């Protein structure tokens, strides 16, 4: 019994000051502000072998080398389906897997603190998701927002922000 399968969890990878997500053997997505700056390589590969595209808080890497050939390609949607329940696949650095149910709101332009093209959502984990047990916390950014379309899991955003209440979260979308 699980919520998300082991292979889906294995796509969530530590990166910079947060996480990213292997969409495919070659495509990696993350949140812009956790990405290392001023570096010459990512995952050992020189920049010249990585197509890099950062738009707002959404960063995509496409590697020339097949970096995760164990994986199949999954669909990256252009945003999450508004009004539907997704799961945020939080890994914590102490080892926990913390999938957080979230009902997704509207895609909107936002400026938290930078220009965010993001989508808000409401966590469905408790009355007020403050703290580590029921919500998102510093270090969680880059975690994928996923949902299942039919029998297949889809990814639609990466974790970017949350209010101090914790109940509202924001993912960056493509
Ligand atoms: C990940 O690095 C971290 C996650 C966040 C911290 C606290 N709980 C979380 O889930 N994200 C941040 O710290 C985030 C970073 C900015 C950097 C520039 C681009 C946007 C993200 N800052 S913050 O502390 O999360 C912002 C707090 C308020 O955020 C919101 C969210 C929704 C909203 O709806 C109206 C208003 C403000």
Describe the protein in words.
The chain is 3% helix and 47% strand. It has 174 residues and is mostly beta strands. The protein has 2 domains: 1-73, Trypsin-like serine proteases (Thrombin, subunit H, Beta Barrel); 74-174, Trypsin-like serine proteases (Thrombin, subunit H), CATH 2.40.10. It has a 6-stranded antiparallel β-barrel with strand order 8-9-10-13-12-11. Residues 18, 33-34, 57, 112-114, 116, 120, 136-138, 140-141, 160-163, 168, 170 line the site of the ligand *[C@@H](O)[C@H](C[C@@H]1CCNC1=O)NC(=O)[C@H](CC1CCCCC1)NS(=O)(=O)CCCOc1ccc(OC)cc1. It is classed as protease/protease inhibitor. The entry lists the keywords protease, norovirus, norwalk virus, antiviral inhibitors, dipeptidyl inhibitor, PROTEASE-PROTEASE INHIBITOR complex. It forms a monomeric assembly.
Topology:
Elements: H1 6-10, E1 12-15, E2 18-22, E3 27-31, E4 41-42, E5 45-46, E6 50-55, E7 58-63, E8 85-91, E9 97-110, E10 116-123, E11 144-149, E12 152-162, E13 168-172
The chain binds the ligand *[C@@H](O)[C@H](C[C@@H]1CCNC1=O)NC(=O)[C@H](CC1CCCCC1)NS(=O)(=O)CCCOc1ccc(OC)cc1.
PDB class: protease/protease inhibitor
Keywords: protease, norovirus, norwalk virus, antiviral inhibitors, dipeptidyl inhibitor, PROTEASE-PROTEASE INHIBITOR complex
Assembly: monomeric
Distance between the termini: 32 Å
Strands ordered across the widest β-sheet: 8-9-10-13-12-11
CATH superfamily of the largest domain: Trypsin-like serine proteases
Q: How many structural units, i.e. domains? A: 2
- What is the percentage of strand-forming residues? over 45%
Main CATH class of the largest domain: Mainly Beta
Continuous helix count:
1
Number of distinct beta strands: 13
Bound heterogens, unique: ligand N38
The portion of residues assigned to helices is under 10%
Largest beta sheet, briefly?
6 strands, antiparallel, barrel
What is the element string, with H for helices and E for strands?
Answer: HEEEEEEEEEEEEE
CATH topology group of the largest domain? Thrombin, subunit H
Based on CA atoms alone, the radius of gyration comes out at 15 Å
Instruction: Provide the CATH architecture of the largest domain.
Output: Beta Barrel
Q: What would you call the shape?
A: globular
Structural class: mainly beta
Catalytic activity: Endopeptidase with a preference for cleavage when the P1 position is occupied by Glu-|-Xaa and the P1' position is occupied by Gly-|-Yaa
Organism: Norovirus (strain Human/NoV/United States/Norwalk/1968/GI) (Hu/NV/NV/1968/US)
Domain Peptidase C37: 4-174
Function: Processes the polyprotein. 3CLpro-RdRp is first released by autocleavage, then all other proteins are cleaved. May cleave host polyadenylate-binding protein thereby inhibiting cellular translation.
